[PDB]
Amino acid sequence: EFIIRIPPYHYIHVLDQNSNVSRVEVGPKTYIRQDNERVLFAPMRMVTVPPRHYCTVANPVSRDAQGLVLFDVTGQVRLRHADLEIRLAQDPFPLYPGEVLEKDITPLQVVLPNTALHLKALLDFEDKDGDKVVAGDEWLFEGPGTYIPRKEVEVVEIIQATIIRQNQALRLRARKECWDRDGKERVTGEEWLVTTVGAYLPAVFEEVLDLVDAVILTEKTALHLRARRNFRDFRGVSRRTGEEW
Amino acid sequence: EFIIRIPPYHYIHVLDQNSNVSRVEVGPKTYIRQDNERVLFAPMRMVTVPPRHYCTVANPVSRDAQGLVLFDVTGQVRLRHADLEIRLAQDPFPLYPGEVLEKDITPLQVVLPNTALHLKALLDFEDKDGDKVVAGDEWLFEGPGTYIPRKEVEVVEIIQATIIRQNQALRLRARKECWDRDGKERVTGEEWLVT
Amino acid sequence: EFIIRIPPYHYIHVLDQNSNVSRVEVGPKTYIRQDNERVLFAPMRM
């Protein structure tokens, strides 16, 4: 049919069979379909991202410096095949040909306070402050704030901070060679204790094991302790392996 | 039908099929529908907000500095899609095309004395006194007064004050790093007593 | 019907029911008849 009335906030795609090319007919205006064109689908409401939401569209249109949608001379539109893009709140937009709504209008994820996100850089990229990120690097998005999703970064899980109370310590095992918040070199399998009172947030490599409670030494008791490796106790005594005290 | 009598305090929407555009025909006057127009619905009574109430309308019309309802040249009306707005008591108003009555005429919530509201800022905004609010910040609307709802602020629950009598103290656990009313630094899990 | 193809050397008359007025649509060109117009007769050779 030639007469194609397109309601406000809707769009259609007419296929010029001359070049078998499709173009997005978007606008609150009716359309005349000629012999050479063939509308692909009825007017579809343009997808709007409500504020505080986001959406990602498969094969985003290969726009330019001004954001003008680069259109192929043949009658198609230049697309970044197989890539993704994050589109935040804006006016309703038409799906140009060769684009798929990969991610719907989903809410921006806001982490609660004393909680963190275990992000990981799937694709090599450069972060906000010129950071030479590489594929595989892990990230901790802590804070009660909101995280704006990104193509090169994937959230793996949400970790929760561990509250270390008074007279308590938390067992931390290095999952890989790393440094402790006190800047102490750690090796894979090395376990240590963090006594800082508060909601201690576990790091990407530091693995929370358990909370160790102190033992209260009255005047009628004392503690019988045998070492397991060479070290120095709090008094500084250089105890040896197997030594009991 | 061409003859469309619109009773006082009612409105209709005629669709100019020429541009498939709808316009709000509001007024205590009859209307003539031509071949190009097509009324969408019979006269609907304009929604009035009774005093001390409020209402929120989906996709509020993108008004201007003077409040003139910016109308699209095509025959539509400029809308702030997907947003909300709080409309208090006023004269009955017509629903311009592309607007949905999100919140009816509900009463303004007045907290009783010695009670408070647990508000939280869903959307980043700036408060009354230029406060750099961020998304997620919590608010306590206490007082026997009345709270005027807002788009960027959501009430989470109504908390009730705890009466501490003589020779008594109340256990207070910090849910997060914070300061006590006596300006005492607190850490998550820290419990103290208020006398 | 909106689509009104007028062959070369032919003409039609569309009645704008708004004013019940008719105008000669002459030309080797197709025509779009809106809701307000109503073609009176098919293209007639001039």
C42 touches chain A (CB under 8 A): no
Residue B107 host element (H or E): strand B100-107
A165 touches chain B (CB under 8 A): yes
Identity of the residue in A110, A113, A163 whose CB atom sits nearest the CB atom of B189:
A163
Nearest to B47 by CA among B56, B39, B38: B56
CA dihedral of residues B133, B134, B140, B142 (deg, nearest 10):
30
Q: Are B180 and B171 in contact (CB under 8 A)?
A: no
Cβ atoms within 10 Å, residue A173: 15
CA dihedral of residues A237, A241, A242, A244 (deg, nearest 10):
10
Resolution of the coordinates, Å: 3.3
B19 touches chain C (CB under 8 A): no
Euclidean distance between CA atoms A148 and A55, whole angstroms = 11
Which candidate in C4, C5, C32 is best for mutational testing of the A interface (most A CBs within 10 A)? C32
Euclidean distance between CA atoms B110 and B104, whole angstroms = 17
What approach was used to elucidate this structure? Answer: cryo-EM
Euclidean distance between CA atoms B72 and B97, whole angstroms = 11
Q: Are B92 and B47 in contact (CB under 8 A)?
A: yes
